[PDB]
Amino acid sequence: GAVTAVPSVFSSPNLASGFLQCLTFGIGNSPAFPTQEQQDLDAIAQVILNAVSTNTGATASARAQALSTALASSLTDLLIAESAESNYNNQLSELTGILSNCFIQTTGSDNPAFVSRIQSLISVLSQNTDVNIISTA
Amino acid sequence: GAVTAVPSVFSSPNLASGFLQCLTFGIGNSPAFPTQEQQDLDAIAQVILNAVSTNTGATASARAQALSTALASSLTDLLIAESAESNYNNQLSELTGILSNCFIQTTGSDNPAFVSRIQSLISVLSQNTDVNIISTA
Secondary structure, X not given: OOOOOOOOHHHOHHHHHHHHHHHHHHOOOXXXXXXXXXXXXXXXXXXXXXXXXXXXXXXXXXXXXXHHHHHHHHXXXXXXXXXXXXXXXXXXXXXXXXXXXXXXXXOOOOOHHHHHHHHHHHHHHOOOOOOOOOOOO | OOOOOOOHHHOOHHHHHHHHHHHXXXXXXXXXXXXXXXXXXXXXHHHHHHHXXXXXXXXXXXXXXHHHHHHHHHHHHHHHHOOOOOOHHHHHHHHHHHHHHXXXXXXXXXOHHHHHHHHXXXXXXXXXXXXXXXXXX
């Protein structure tokens, strides 16, 4: 552990715009992301970055961290659900690429912390595929 | 093994707002949350409820699910960061209660899925330290 690279995006409203406008271009550019599914991705993503646009104060650091995981959490949870539960990895490969690429373009780095948060969330999110609770049997 | 019921709070912007109207009072009435930390929590929480409020479309159902995870994620992440990643357990015990209590009042249920998601996210939030990996150089 111990990350030696801090993502300044979530700590700067100006960078939030750049990252947001990168997402809306990347997600709509990848072959794995269809138009109606892009709707939700872009919509949820813009909310997180807008929360960065209102970051100011001593708690901005904590907010940045929270938004970092919140972004990964919401996007991944949404994606998994509408990707046939099992086939979510098909688009996840592209999603992670876009995210990391946008970090490169916006904060000038990859930020290993973000992707680490993602991998951690994926495990617990996909864990809830026990939806065989159908009371038909 | 349990029939999953969907909380109407994530399907109704009027309830989403009401849920926030509970959080703002509950957090500010808990002896583990300072007046400053409270207002920050409220500020982060409202972001998710505003996303619930913007639930419109075919995939709004899945958004409700993702936002559920995002709410648990962001609030806990914010909390852990400002509590040295070790003292979070003190305030975590109150936060988790407030959330469920607000679900009880707003949507009329404990929401077993939400609390389970919280604990699952604890397993990943408390699996790595990120609040002091900052390298602003």
